[PDB]
Design an enzyme around this catalytic site. Structure first.
Site, PDB file in Angstrom:
ATOM      1  N   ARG B 236      -3.990 -97.790 -60.976  1.00 44.65           N
ATOM      2  CA  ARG B 236      -4.450 -96.508 -61.080  1.00 44.65           C
ATOM      3  C   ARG B 236      -6.098 -96.530 -61.435  1.00 44.65           C
ATOM      4  NH1 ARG B 236      -2.865 -91.138 -62.434  1.00 44.65           N
ATOM      5  NH2 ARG B 236      -1.363 -91.159 -64.134  1.00 44.65           N
ATOM      6  N   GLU B 265      -8.940 -88.851 -59.259  1.00 46.51           N
ATOM      7  CA  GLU B 265      -7.643 -88.382 -58.864  1.00 46.51           C
ATOM      8  C   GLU B 265      -6.751 -88.248 -60.039  1.00 46.51           C
ATOM      9  OE1 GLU B 265      -5.589 -90.792 -55.179  1.00 46.51           O
ATOM     10  OE2 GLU B 265      -6.588 -92.246 -56.404  1.00 46.51           O
ATOM     11  N   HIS B 291      -6.250 -94.309 -51.246  1.00 45.58           N
ATOM     12  CA  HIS B 291      -4.614 -94.072 -51.929  1.00 45.58           C
ATOM     13  C   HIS B 291      -3.632 -94.609 -50.956  1.00 45.58           C
ATOM     14  CE1 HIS B 291      -2.675 -92.975 -55.637  1.00 45.58           C
ATOM     15  NE2 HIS B 291      -1.747 -93.620 -55.095  1.00 45.58           N
TER      16      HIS B 291
END
Ligand SMILES: NC(=O)c1ccc[n+]([C@@H]2O[C@H](COP(=O)([O-])OP(=O)(O)OC[C@H]3O[C@@H](n4cnc5c(N)ncnc54)[C@H](O)[C@@H]3O)[C@@H](O)[C@H]2O)c1
Lengths: 332, 326
Positions: B236, B265, B291
């Protein structure tokens, strides 16, 4: 006293190992000298350390009659006329193991980058236009894939070891079969060249360049691939016919081509392309590197050390440990 | 036929499976539509197949009173008020973990690409200036390196598995430690967060994002790093501080950063960046991916298929297998 010419830059520690035994005439810069410049330097050299841009033929040897040893800082000595070295009583030596592992790493990296559209993925994020996940850049991964090795020697083996645990089905074709013990241990099945190219999701080349391997991967063979198959070449350019690879790319039968090596590098070929076709250079389903398989400083240092030990052995009148050829030596 | 809105593009075969049971209002393009537009579409829809860019709060649910199922083609529900879903009697559905593996494949691809300067090397030959082997682009291998995992759940394990045979020395720090048998199997040495950053040539992130994890990789930690250390973030974005990484890259202590995820994000945080710093973007010692961790065709197909079946089960009136609520 004996002159030694070194065609490319080597680590300080290597010059220190040689300097007591030899007269070093070094190229401690970042450049590849000219064919005519190395000839001039080698004219009365007792010895030579050679690298990948070097090419040695009977013509070169005729102009350098004091040469006793050519120490190759490499594995594939295809650009070196071994017979002619022997005919002139010159030892030729190579480096059998040290290039293997980082080349195997690069190749797996290429397989992954090629299969996952890394070049454009990255270009896209770099364009500033990224805003989150999109249904885009769907690729080919190793899990559940059939991976096929052409060749099963040092890099073949090191790549298969590196893919244990990747959930792939491994298969190979090679000049010599692996014993059943190694096959069962690595999860490897032996198959014919035809079957390799017809069943493999990834095809990784791990062959040397010789007469039997010149243009082995050709239109006929590429015509066989499952649509979208990915081909990876860490070995030598002219194992592949680059023009037929282009054509399989454009028609969309071959999914991608990654290479660290190119036809244009194979100096022993009179009819070598003088460049990589701009059309392959610009094709999107590709990923390339400039012959950097062994480009890790710690490794390069050991490649150089191995070459230097060989050269020094030869100049001490011994049979070098990594001699590829054989000269008359006195018995007991 | 109950009405189903598919928020993003699916494979033809998911449509074909769904048409006979659902009226489909599709978004068979590359774009993610505006939430105003998805709300219009879902006003009288019985079902929604959501993807990563979707957010669903009480407000969304208020505007869509006929909604029976949200079938998500994803696994983390940060963007999804689960209690709102249940309060309003809406099934909220996830998929099983098909994402970890291809993400781990990509992560190692990135560590190798970053360490071997793949972007710059590729551009160099595409430039047409390649005249054969030169003694440059020297890079960092995995062999004889120390690679440290920060975190070690599904992603940490997938990657460790894939790094057997690579001759690197493996080590990790995690809140939830591994059992001795697996540590043994994987040659995995357990260390403290500080020791991991001080002694790793490659650091591969495998952490969830939460309050404890927010900006975990900060300036203090990056300052411990060995010169030229390579950092890889596939987990992440906001577990690292991108400003601190850039800063670390620019002084040259951190030798490189690869990520498949970015702070911009993480829509939960109010203080989130609005893009990726253009100077990070322009930095030569980087490698980025939009991503695409699970962006493997077989996997995306299976993901949509599981989403579809959860939706079909909810509609026919059954409890969905992958129901996250109730
Ligand atoms: N990219 C780089 O920087 C780099 C680095 C090292 C080696 N290489 C190249 O890759 C080549 C292979 O390396 P290696 O170290 O594994 O060599 P190797 O000699 O250890 O193995 C070669 C293998 O190919 C097989 N082979 C030969 N002819 C064949 C044929 N006609 N069909 C099928 N198999 C055949 C042999 O049986 C052998 O197993 C080297 O010769 C060199 O040309 C490139």
């Amino acid at each position: 006293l004996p002159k030694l010419v070194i065609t490319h830059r080597v680590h300080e520690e290597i010059l220190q190992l040689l300097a007591p035994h030899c007269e070093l005439i070094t190229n401690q810069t970042d450049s590849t000298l000219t064919r005519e410049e190395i000839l001039r330097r080698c004219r009365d050299a007792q010895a030579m350390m050679a690298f990948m841009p070097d090419r040695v033929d009977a013509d070169f040897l005729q102009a350098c009659p004091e040469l006793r040893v050519i120490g190759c800082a490499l594995k594939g000595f295809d650009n070196f006329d071994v017979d002619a070295c022997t005919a002139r009583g010159v030892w030729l030596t190579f480096v059998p193991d040290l290039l293997t592992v980082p080349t195997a790493e690069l190749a797996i990296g290429l397989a992954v980058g090629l299969g996952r559209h890394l070049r454009a993925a990255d270009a896209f994020v770099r364009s500033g236009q990224f805003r989150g996940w999109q249904p885009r850049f769907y690729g080919t991964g190793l899990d559940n894939a059939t991976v096929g090795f052409l060749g099963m020697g040092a890099i073949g083996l090191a790549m298969a070891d590196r893919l244990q645990g990747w959930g792939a089905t491994l298969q190979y074709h090679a000049a010599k079969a692996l014993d059943t013990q190694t096959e069962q241990r690595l999860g490897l099945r032996q198959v014919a060249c035809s079957e390799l190219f017809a069943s493999s999701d990834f095809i990784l080349l791990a062959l040397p360049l010789n007469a039997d391997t010149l243009h082995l991967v050709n239109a006929e063979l590429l015509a066989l691939v499952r649509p979208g198959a990915l081909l990876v070449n860490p070995c030598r350019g002219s194992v592949v016919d680059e023009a037929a690879v282009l054509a399989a790319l454009e028609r969309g039968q071959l999914g991608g081509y990654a290479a660290d090596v190119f036809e244009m590098e194979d100096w022993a070929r009179a009819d070598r392309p003088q460049q990589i076709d701009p059309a392959l250079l610009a094709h999107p389903n590709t990923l390339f590197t400039p012959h950097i398989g062994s480009a890790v400083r710690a490794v390069r240092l050991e490649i150089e050390r191995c070459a230097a030990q060989n050269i020094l052995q030869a100049l001490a009148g011994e049979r070098p440990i990594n001699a590829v050829n054989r000269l008359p030596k006195a018995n007991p």
